[PDB]
Amino acid sequence: TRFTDEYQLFEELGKGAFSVVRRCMKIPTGQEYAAKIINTKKLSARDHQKLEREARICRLLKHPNIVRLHDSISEEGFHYLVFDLVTGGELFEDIVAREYYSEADASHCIQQILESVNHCHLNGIVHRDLKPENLLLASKSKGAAVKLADFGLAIEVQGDQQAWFGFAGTPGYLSPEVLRKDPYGKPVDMWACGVILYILLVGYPPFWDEDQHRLYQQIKAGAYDFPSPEWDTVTPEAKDLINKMLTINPAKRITASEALKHPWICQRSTVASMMHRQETVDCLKKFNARRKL
Ligand SMILES: CN(C)CCNC(=O)c1cccc(-c2cnc3ccc(-c4cccs4)nn23)c1
């Protein structure tokens, strides 16, 4: 009964089909947290496994770019995962509020995302649902680091053991191997990082169709473009990283630590363009609006 007795519940930060996240304060310290609240009534043994796996994954991952777990509390009927509170909102909503936004800032963001995908992979965790809603920002007052969130769909892998761990993911970000029902692993997070990198540069997604089945065929072919004019001002090194992240052969796809050594990431001041990209800001506003529905 540790949560009800020591915490005060506040407003809802987000809601889904099977959980809710609410802000909360610890009554003794006055420190503020985010509580993920899961109904544990009448779960199967399969669901109990998934929920204790989520709590295990969140306890293990300690990294400046991953939401930090403060306590996992089991009350009768409910489970609470209590994370340190990050107040900076979604990454993509902070970007559209910037008056200066360049490839160097995109590279900065993707470098933090990559550090976190890397830390997951070193601990043998595949996130499987990288997407803008899962990319929070720490307060500008605390450094504005990017925070990877929500490991509810994550899996634990041993070494490079690859298998068909079932369908999971969000359609625009799904890798070709998942869509083929082929065995997959860590590379599915690098594919998603390439879709996010792409959107971070131009404000719209690399694969898109109003017909989801045609969307899937485009993904499986790996058929994205760098159309003029917007891509004409983008450096070739940034286009090269996308190319290595969006390869349909998962064995040849670049890995997270290899991508942290790409010159566009680790030689940012000399390689990434520093011009403001106002057309990306505008497209991203339309991107963010559509995803809100
Ligand atoms: C879309 N998913 C992210 C899940 C639903 N949550 C939201 O939409 C949301 C929106 C705005 C802010 C927050 C927020 C603020 N501080 C924290 C700390 C930790 C976490 C999470 C850990 C595991 C899952 S959320 N969320 N969190 C969540």
Closest by CA to 199, choosing from 116, 119, 88, 279, is: 279
Ligand 1 centroid distance, CA of 188 (Å): 22
Known binding positions for ATP: 13-21, 36
Resolution in A: 2.0
Within this chain, do residues 99 and 40 fall inside the same structural domain, yes or no?
Answer: no
Residues 97 and 241 in one domain: yes
User: In Å, how far are 16, 17, 84 from 39, measured between CA atoms?
Assistant: 12, 11, 21
Cis peptide before 229 (omega within 30 of 0): yes
Residues 6+ apart with CB under 8 A from 170: 129, 131
Residue found under tokens 């963010």: 288
Q: How far is CA 234 from the centre of its chain?
A: 23
Q: What is the C-alpha to C-alpha distance for residues 205 and 289, in angstroms, rounded to an integer?
A: 14
Domain end residue (candidates: 55, 85, 115) = 85
Angle (deg, nearest 10), helices 236-245 and 187-202: 150
Residues in a beta bridge with 38 = 79
**Distance, CA 13 to ligand 1 centroid (Å)?**
7
We report the CATH number of the domain holding residue 90 as 1.10.510.10
Residue 138 backbone dihedrals phi, psi, to 5 degrees: -65, 160
Q: Of the candidates 49, 65, 85, which is a domain's last residue?
A: 85
149 C-beta closer than 6 A to ligand 1:
yes
Provide the residue count of the chain: 293
Q: How far is CA 4 from the centre of its chain?
A: 30
Q: Whose CA is nearest to atom 23 of ligand 1?
A: 150
- Do 20 and 5 contact (CB within 8 A), yes or no? no
Radius of gyration of the chain from its Cα atoms, rounded to whole angstroms? 19
Residue ending a domain, choose from 52, 85, 118: 85
Distance 64 CA to ligand 1 centre (A): 16
221/41 Cα distance (integer angstroms): 43
- My answer on whether 13 and 125 are in the same domain is no
Residues 64 and 107 occupy one common structural domain: no
Please give the distance, rounded to the nearest whole angstrom, from the Cα atom of residue 33 to the centre of ligand 1: 10
Task: Name the residue at shortest CA distance from atom 24 of ligand 1.
Answer: 150
For residue 87 the two structure tokens come to 């107040």
Q: Which of 19, 20, 21, 83 has the most ligand 1 atoms within 8 A of CB, as the residue to mutate?
A: 21
- Give the integer Cα–Cα distance in Å for 20 and 135: 17
The CATH number of the domain holding residue 55 is 3.30.200.20
- Full residue range of the structural domain in which residue 238 is found: 86-293
Instruction: Give which of 165, 171, 166 is closest to 216, Cα–Cα.
Output: 171
Contact call for residues 127 and 148 (beta carbons, < 8 A): yes
Compute the distance between CA of residue 254 and CA of residue 268 in angstroms, rounded to an integer: 19
Please identify which residue in the block is written with the tokens 């990294």: 63
> Are 281 and 164 in the same domain?
yes
Please report the DSSP string for the chain in residue order. -HHHHHEEEEEEEEE-SS-EEEEEEETTT--EEEEEEEE-TT--HHHHHHHHHHHHHHHH---TTBPPEEEEEEETTEEEEEEE---S-BHHHHHTT-S---HHHHHHHHHHHHHHHHHHHHTTEE-----GGGEEE--GGGT--EEE---TT-EE--TT--B-----S-GGG--HHHHTT--B-THHHHHHHHHHHHHHHHSS-SS--SSHHHHHHHHHTT-----TTGGGGS-HHHHHHHHHHT-S-TTTSPPHHHHTTSHHHHTHHHHS--S--HHHHHHHHHHHHHHH-
Query: 108 and 133 in contact (C-beta within 8 Å)?
Result: no
Q: Is 135 in the pocket of ligand 1 (CB under 6 A)?
A: no
Rounded CA-CA distance 15/17 in Å is: 7
Kindly report the number of other CB atoms within 10 A of residue 175's CB atom.
25
Residue 149 alpha carbon to ligand 1 centre in Å: 6
| Atom 3 of ligand 1: nearest residue by CA position | 134
Residues tagged active-site = 129
CA-nearest residue, atom 25 of ligand 1? 150
Angle at 280 (CA atoms; ends 277, 283), nearest 5 degrees: 150
Q: How far apart (Å, rounded) are the C-alpha atoms in residues 20 and 63?
A: 24
- Of all protein residues, the one whose alpha carbon is nearest to atom 19 of ligand 1 is 83
> Measuring CA to CA, which residue among 94, 89, 148 is closest to residue 121?
148
Please check whether residue 190 is in contact with residue 245, taking contact to mean a CB–CB distance below 8 angstroms. yes
Q: Is 66 in the pocket of ligand 1 (CB under 6 A)?
A: no
Q: Are residues 183 and 284 in the same domain?
A: yes
- 34 and 169 assigned to the same domain: no
120 with 260, same domain?
A: yes
Feature table: binding site? 13-21, 36
Is residue 73 within 6 Å of ligand 1 at its C-beta?
Answer: no
Structure tokens at 289: 């609006």
Domain count, the chain: 2
Residue 220 sits in the same domain as residue 207: yes
Distances (CA, A) of 233 to 246, 270, 273: 20, 16, 8
If we measure between CA atoms, which residue out of 24, 19, 23, 21 comes closest to residue 7? 24
Across the strands, what pairs with 51? Answer: none
Type of residue numbered 223: A
Query: Do 263 and 154 sit in the same domain of this protein?
Result: yes
d(CA 247, CA 245): 6
The answer to whether residues 143 and 243 belong to one domain is yes
